[PDB]
Amino acid sequence: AGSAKKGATLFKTRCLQCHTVEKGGPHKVGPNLHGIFGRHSGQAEGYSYTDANIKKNVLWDENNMSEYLTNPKKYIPGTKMAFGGLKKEKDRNDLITYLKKATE
Numbered sequence: 001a002g003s004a005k006k007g008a009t010l011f012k013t014r015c016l017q018c019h020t021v022e023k024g025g026p027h028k029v030g031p032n033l034h035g036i037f038g039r040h041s042g043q044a045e046g047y048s049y050t051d052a053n054i055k056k057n058v059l060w061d062e063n064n065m066s067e068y069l070t071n072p073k074k075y076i077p078g079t080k081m082a083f084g085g086l087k088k089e090k091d092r093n094d095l096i097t098y099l100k101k102a103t104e
């Protein structure tokens with residue numbers, strides 16, 4: 001079982017620079033992530049995505065989010081998300097446990 005509290009710290013240190021999670025939170029370098037799970041990639045209104053992210057056209061879930069976060073440019077070549085990857089499966093599980101609740 002992932003640990004959301006550890007996930008929240010991982011989000012703060014690794015993601016928060018570029019992303020907010022709450023409903024009505026602002027777009028920053030990256031898009032606000034409210035409602036990300038169960039939505040197709042590249043669909044947050046008011047954000048200018050790469051065609052790479054739009055045409056990947058993946059329905060985000062816990063599993064493909066983990067694949068993506070391992071290595072974003074591998075999963076979506078051409079993406080403008082400048083993030084190398086979360087190496088540790090436990091860190092991905094914790095982060096995603098947090099993100100599923102925080103973006104709900």
Ligand SMILES: O=P(O)(O)Cc1cc2c(O)c(c1)Cc1cc(CP(=O)(O)O)cc(c1O)Cc1cc(CP(=O)(O)O)cc(c1O)Cc1cc(CP(=O)(O)O)cc(c1O)C2
Nearest residue numbers: 040042049050051052053054055056057058076077078079
């Ligand atoms: O309008 P935009 O800009 O916001 C976004 C956009 C729209 C289109 C574009 O050609 C490109 C970008 C260029 C492009 C980029 C990549 C990414 P990359 O390889 O990294 O460079 C990849 C592709 C691109 O063509 C390969 C590609 C992938 C699929 C799978 P899928 O993504 O749908 O699941 C289907 C098509 C397709 O060419 C046919 C197609 C279908 C529809 C839907 P519809 O029928 O509603 O019109 C619209 C367009 C299409 O070409 C038009």
Ligand SMILES: O=P(O)(O)Cc1cc2c(O)c(c1)Cc1cc(CP(=O)(O)O)cc(c1O)Cc1cc(CP(=O)(O)O)cc(c1O)Cc1cc(CP(=O)(O)O)cc(c1O)C2
Nearest residue numbers: 067069070071072074075082083084085086087088089090
């Ligand atoms: O499978 P892929 O391919 O999609 C993704 C992948 C997997 C591995 C890779 O070596 C690379 C890429 C190459 C690489 C990339 C970056 C990122 P960037 O420089 O931006 O390009 C950074 C590094 C790379 O070596 C430096 C690096 C950083 C840390 C975090 P930290 O210690 O600084 O905090 C930990 C390791 C590490 O080498 C050890 C480590 C742990 C685990 C998970 P586990 O231990 O569970 O096996 C797997 C691999 C590891 O090397 C294998």
Ligand code: HEC
Nearest residue numbers: 014015018029030041042043049050053079080081082083
């Ligand atoms: C800035 C330096 C970023 C950091 C750090 C992280 N992300 Fe990001 N992300 C960023 C951009 C600029 C974009 C859009 C990319 C594009 O090619 O258009 C993104 C995108 C995402 C997405 C996809 C969103 C969608 O399809 O609507 C997700 C799910 C995402 N980012 C998550 C995320 C997480 C969890 C991060 C920390 C591990 C993270 N990103 C870091 C910019 C930046």
Ligand SMILES: [Cl-]
Nearest residue numbers: 017027028029
């Ligand atoms: Cl900001």
